[PDB]
Symmetry: D2
Subunit: 419 residues, 4 copies
């Protein structure tokens, strides 16, 4: 089925078709002069997918307040319905990331709804950073690394349950992010807490299917404000290496210390085969969870530059999971996810334009200026025509947000859902 | 009234009296050899007070979750009862800061309960960073600087109501902290938003009694994640200078960019007569709101060093409002506030030990090493005996938290108040 | 001509066809967006940024300096090199001098400038290092030093900078000092600032009627605990205290991690104290890297504030624009060329912003479309506009390629002896 | 003896009475706390930290260097000054050399060391700067340079450092390089690291059976975009890859803002790769300030992790301790004296932590009492312990006071020619 009327999509596409043809043909000619086939780029772009977070479909908030908009989803099924719009218009978000227990519901019904909407499911996300109804042990002082054996056991069991749910809907990975840490010096013994965490994760790994991957995710701080067990990529590497071949590291762009060179972390994990996936978003201060590329678009391009270089270097078996992990506090969640998915494809497309042979030459000759200008020649290229054409050719909209607004979807769900 | 039984306080004090006498006498002898009269220090420490936040006695949380403890206060009345315990045991927190509309209630009752508990009221706190039930205009996109005139008017009226409540309870100041800002480049026109904020604040200023002060509080980020209207002390100064004599700047320790020299900001505000007050807490990453001094005790000392320097140079018209502004997510709120107030008095006491004459001499001759060592000689001094003796002589506890736990207060209120439930924090 | 005209023409012709195709395509796209590319190119052709005399030589860190070939031996060699940057980019007609590094007969400096087609921007004083024969050391400070005689010496140095500037055509003095402390207690924050204010008041008295005095803040380095002029708040206090001729200079790399710099720019403009800019890029500290090489969007956002000021009708707004960088691992001339290009790039994109649309989205709190409105401008590849601007004004379509084709570096390497001691 | 024995004795007797009072008072307080002050003093007396030979000379920034009087020039003058620090603090018996700065006949160095009562700690190689006559420049890197001959030259230099070390009593080589990039694209992150690992493997082969190889990470400077060995994660990969003799060196000021450094220390210890420390303090970047002058609690928290290990004697836990600072505005000897003091101070306080009580509060999740347990130790003024340890071992009760009373600085100023009177 189609959440957005096909006639609206056709209408809004035809309205912008002439201009797109002009821009696409112009870009094609420019690229041809640069020895690049625009068709080959568009072909790869229409194959690039990034998962949308079920929890980012509703309006997000801070510890100070939540300001919901109209037609907020009542649950996971409404969320899937809204995710269907993002995929229909961008054609870059075929899979949805579920969060348990936030999205707990009959797995069979979830799969049924997903299939009907043309949506698949990406990595499952466990939640032991908050307490659920009737929970025997609280995670106030931790979960997988809690000092209490029974609490760690309960946390392990929760993760295994997430795996069961995922196996029923077609998910092939479990992402584990916990808030475990301390707010005061001395509250936790750094090493003992990490030892407890490794032991618990070993139990989860033992219950991990052999066609699944286990992603551990580091974060410098929040909710813990003094120390965090899985605080950075170094600790994360130790975890993945210790657990096994199926265990890898997930890199969330907003989880690093100020000024960190994140693209280098990406390169390092790839070199040692532990880059499991990404959580895309942008930020300026902390884990701001803003729309991808809205603050620092070049950094996003530089991360993708390392991914494309890995392919160019001949790295094998490298298929990192791509997921958006954002909070939309002051915009229509659907529009933000739409443009964020767009921005990720934008950075990817520009990375594909880098003249790898030229760059390699400038790197070997230590021609720093031309090496950086080689990256800029790709990054400065406005690939919007490629992104728009890719969408058009695949059933999407030339201008996703414009078509979304022309459809009146928000007003529609606002009337179908409570205030 | 005595939230904590006097027999328990006396008992727990006598149990530690012998050791305290020994430590106090030893420190007194050491200070004497250093030309300092311990009695003079203790006398000033007993008179140093810092306000406790009414909302601080309840367990706090993050956007990810909240894990309330037992006996959580139901409202302002329960909160005042808990604050009374902090004051009784530390004798450093006689005043409480209210937040509206969280603590809205009959002013007469608030004053009556405060007087009965031996508590006064510090600066009022307005709230236009969240929406209340039945509110006509949302603050989602701002309040005092919102693009919608009616929304700014509503925010102004709210602040004026806070002043009215404050006058009725004995308060003499209004602290204004808003989340106003943007999460995306272009969303807000920096200049126009600030102009709107200034115009609205001018209206609030007009409602200030002759003996009141208006404190604007800067914050680098959160809830706004790209830009914030009142983002730093520079913008804050422009605000205070523009509004008038009654307008000053409030400095919250955890509201600055990484590595910022906060003690210099304090000095600058004092120099230009705009240091309105402080919001004490500690942090390591962002506006962590941790227990004061639990992370960087020396920084707290350095801030107080600037305060004592001004307090010693007879800086006239210098009465900065001191307040604790913390969130207690993994401890008993009352215990943390107790030790936080203690740490603040600790930093103050150590600042009092600094040999100002010696320091000035080393500054003039550019003797950096001895200048810094002069501060360290004061900071390295364990003033706990002075803090404990000050509490003992004023009706407090030698060891506040030990006495608190010995009284069984938490278990008591846990049995009198309804149970709470853990839940999310606001992310979804 | 530092670079042979036949080389510039040859390299321009080689790229003319492609430039025509790209410029005409961009023109059509902009026309569809309601923008006149000719109007934008006409404005870009007139955007100038000053080149630092000290940036034409290779820079270094406290750990090492690795000079290249043909390093300029003095200010005259430096001006000759700056002439190359102006000839090829046509965006750097003025040079910033630093005293005493560039001390020389003002008449000779002026004569060399005129001969090369170069002017002089704001003068820069230096009381963050000791020169020979100095009666007092600046080890513990200069304008804010505890010793009155030392402050007096620093004041006289700044006045000498003004005298030199008056003779060569300069109209402003930029004052950046390292004054601060490395240890808590070493300095009395307030007294040090008062000392600074008194000294600057004396320097202000020496300013001609049409001159400006720019004070520059910096969070740290060389002082690692406190710095007298540490941020824009202190800087504003200085400017407001000194008078109408005193304004603040904003150096992009002098702010705390994560600082919203573009907002500082907006605040200073609102209160009429934005004197000028020191452009460069950075990732960690005051890295002094080529402008826009690290965070091109931030550079655009700063220019967005500058263009908005013009749109709001701010009167008498003529901020000074200067590049302040250190080239440690590249040919200084090439980096300055591309840095000047990046600055014009950000400026050009700022001009493309549909502010009519932006104002509507801001009023309606449509954050998504507001940010997308800025992005539609920023995502636009304005290189064809920059290249055409150069073609029309005697510059090179591809400045660095032309510079390399000219063999200029090898030429000066053969003419200039490398320092041995 | 660099410092006259009569001066040391005189300045000790002058402060003996007060010390007796303070030491006894602290001893009584600790006894009421179940702690034997003597056990602490005995351990403090044996805690040593190496002094950098280059640390006794005045340091500077990229903007300027302001030398003091009697600047030591050459390793011999430097060792003479280092001897003063050891004589007065008794906490710095070993000196760390830096090659080629300290190049000299090994037999002569060893002889001078023995004569002054000084030993030698880890050797430090230098491939972050170019020495005269050098065949290949390190401008674009050293061990990870793209040019094979340059990497070979860097490897040979490090092997030479090992040979010098073997001749003087050293048992480790610390490798810190500036290798990195200033621009995105300049370096291929992975290939540069591959080259580094291969080059380090060659240096590893030259290590005697009882030697250690310490690689040191640094976020930035001299590289301002990326650094090959940028953090502890990369450092761990290096040490684990090279072998048992390879470990990581943690320099306090080489981390990103807000980093929890004590956790990094704990992680390295758990995996047996904590080779040693480079002590100093900072507020902004790699400020290289006097240890504990800015954040004394952080220093204590680092030592809390060390003592937690020293108490149990963890496998592979025998960290080398070294001071790595730059003294730009103080007498280098005085700063090193007080820095070594602060290091012993933090160690002594960490020794006071009631581990049993702490472990209990950690298991019960009593965060408030757990942190208060650390504070009870940290708030304790251990100066009497540090002073008594010095007095009992031939040092000075008040090191800096004795240093000034001796007139040493004026003495060496009279023996050493400055650049200018
Ligand atoms: C939504 C949650 O946010 C995190 O990035 C933690 O900040 C994690 O990846 C998800 O579980
Ligand atoms: C509790 C609130 O927190 C703030 O510090 C803002 O972060 C403000 O001072 C109070 O209103
Ligand atoms: C080159 C110098 O560098 C500064 O930016 C200070 O860091 C100043 O503007 C100039 O004097
Ligand atoms: C003195 C040098 O400084 C470093 O810390 C690098 O910043 C290194 O450890 C030493 O070689
Ligand atoms: Mn994430
Ligand atoms: Mn996150
Ligand atoms: Mn506050
Ligand atoms: Mn706050
Ligand atoms: Mn500058
Ligand atoms: Mn600078
Ligand atoms: Mn080091
Ligand atoms: Mn260093």
């Amino acid at each position: 089925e189609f959440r957005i009327a096909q006639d609206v999509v056709a209408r809004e596409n035809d309205r912008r078709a002439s201009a797109l043809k002009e821009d696409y043909e112009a870009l094609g000619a420019n690229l041809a002069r640069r020895g690049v086939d625009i068709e080959a780029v568009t072909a790869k772009v229409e194959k690039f997918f990034v998962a949308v977070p079920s929890w980012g479909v509703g309006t997000g908030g801070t510890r100070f307040a939540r300001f919901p908009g109209t037609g907020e989803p009542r649950g996971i099924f409404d969320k899937l319905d809204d995710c269907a719009v993002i995929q229909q218009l961008t054609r870059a978000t075929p899979n949805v990331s579920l969060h348990i227990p936030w999205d707990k519901a009959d797995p069979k019904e979830l799969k049924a709804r997903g299939d009907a909407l043309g949506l698949g499911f990406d990595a499952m996300n466990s939640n032991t950073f908050s307490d659920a109804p009737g929970q025997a042990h609280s995670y106030k002082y931790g979960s997988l690394s809690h000092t209490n054996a029974a609490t760690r056991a309960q946390a392990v069991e929760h993760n295994l349950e997430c795996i069961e749910i995922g196996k029923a809907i077609g998910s092939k990975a479990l992402t584990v992010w916990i808030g475990d840490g301390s707010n005061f010096p001395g509250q936790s013994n750094f090493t003992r807490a990490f030892e407890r965490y490794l032991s618990a994760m070993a139990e989860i790994y033992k219950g991990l299917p052999d066609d699944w991957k286990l992603f551990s995710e580091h974060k410098m701080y929040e909710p813990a404000f003094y120390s965090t067990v899985v605080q950075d990529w170094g600790t994360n590497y130790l975890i993945a290496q210790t657990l096994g071949p199926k265990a890898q590291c997930l890199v969330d762009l907003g989880h690093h210390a100020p000024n960190t060179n994140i693209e280098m972390i990406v390169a390092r994990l790839i070199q040692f085969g532990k880059l499991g996936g990404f959580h895309f978003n942008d930020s300026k201060y902390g884990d701001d969870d803003l729309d991808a590329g809205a603050i620092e678009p070049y950094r996003l391009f530089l991360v993708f530059n390392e991914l494309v270089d890995a392919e160019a270097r001949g790295v094998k078996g490298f298929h990192p999971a791509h997921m958006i992990n954002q909070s939309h506090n002051v915009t229509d969640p659907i529009e933000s996810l739409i443009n964020s998915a767009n921005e990720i494809r934008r950075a990817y497309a520009q990375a594909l334009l880098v003249d790898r042979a030229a760059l390699s030459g400038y790197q070997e000759d230590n021609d720093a200026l031309m090496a950086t200008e080689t990256l800029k020649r790709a990054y400065r290229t406005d690939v919007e025509p490629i992104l728009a054409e890719a969408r058009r050719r695949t059933g999407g909209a030339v201008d996703p947000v414009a078509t979304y607004r022309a459809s009146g979807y928000r007003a529609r769900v606002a009337a179908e859902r409570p205030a």
